[PDB]
């Protein structure tokens, strides 16, 4: 990921907020020399991505985690709202398209987590908290979680470096920016909201 200065986060908390809002992540490691990726729910422990700790899990039957034993470096990609920007939206005569998006990339050493129960229970808590209503695991469901643990592998990543991209057209002039934000208002409310938040100072 390369992040041009004008697409950097306006405030550092924006990276953590993107991570928390988009927990279904891509966990990537270099099995041999080839990249291999698993889609998995990953949560953040700590106030900031940099220096924070990521917690995730996958199927034990997914052999990806077996490469994690050597504690190699992994990349976790969190992707927020995104959308194609067609030059039709600009209404200007020389133009080229782009794609607007926001993403956080976290890199660090992965470690298998012995407390797989705690990881999945924390993941439930995080993902359900903003739903209306939030699902509260019953005692029966918590005993179920315990019974399921042989089939799951949890892992932790201590974040050594992170980058965040907020590519949200903030380099356009006022009229063209207004057209882009307006065009995303109906079809892509999530992207328009991120657009609004990127200009809040």
Q: Which residues in this chain contact ligand HEM in the complex, by CB under 6 A?
A: 2, 38, 40-41, 57-59, 62, 84, 96-99, 120, 123-124, 127, 145, 148-149, 151-152
**CA 26, CA 19: separation in Å to the nearest integer?**
12
Under a CB-based contact definition with an 8 Å cutoff, are residues 23 and 129 in contact? no
Answer left, alpha or beta for residue 46, where phi above 0 means left and psi between -120 and 50 means alpha: left
Kindly state the smallest distance separating residue 120's Cβ from ligand HEM, in Å: 3
Q: How does DSSP classify residue 38?
A: E
Strand partners of residue 165 = 103
From 5-13, 42-50, 85-93, 179-187, span contacting its own copies (CB under 8 A): 85-93
Q: How does DSSP classify residue 160?
A: E
Kindly state the smallest distance separating residue 201's Cβ from its own copies, in Å: 26
Phi, psi for residue 182 in degrees, rounded to 5: -60, -45
Q: Which of 57, 64, 179, 181 binds its own copies (CB under 8 A)?
A: 64
Nearest to 86 by CA among 168, 180, 170: 180
Which residues in this chain contact its own copies in the complex, by CB under 8 A? 1-2, 4, 24, 26, 28-30, 33-39, 41, 58-59, 61-64, 72-75, 77, 79, 82, 84, 86-88, 93-97, 99, 101, 103, 105, 107, 120, 124, 127-128, 131, 133, 135, 138, 140-141, 143-145, 148, 165
């Amino acid at each position: 990921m390369f992040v041009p200065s004008y697409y950097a986060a306006a405030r550092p908390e924006q990276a953590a907020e993107l991570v928390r809002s988009n927990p279904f992540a891509l966990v990537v490691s270099a099995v041999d020399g080839v990249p291999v990726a698993t889609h998995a729910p990953v949560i953040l422990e700590g106030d900031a991505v940099e220096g924070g700790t990521l917690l995730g899990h996958m199927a034990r039957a997914n052999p990806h985690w077996r490469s994690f034993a050597s504690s190699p470096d992994v990349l976790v990609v969190f992707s927020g709202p995104h959308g194609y920007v067609s030059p039709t939206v600009y209404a200007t005569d020389p133009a080229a398209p782009t794609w607007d998006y926001a993403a956080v990339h976290a890199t660090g050493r992965v470690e298998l987590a012995e407390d797989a129960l705690d990881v999945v229970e924390r993941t439930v808590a995080a993902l359900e908290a903003p739903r209306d209503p939030a699902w509260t695991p019953t005692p029966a469901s918590r005993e179920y979680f315990r019974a399921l643990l042989p089939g799951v592998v949890a892992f932790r990543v201590r974040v050594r470096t992170e980058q965040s991209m907020f590519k949200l057209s903030q380099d356009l002039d006022a009229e063209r920016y207004a057209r882009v934000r307006e065009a995303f208002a109906a079809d892509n409310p999530g992207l328009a909201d991120l657009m609004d938040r990127s200009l809040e100072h």
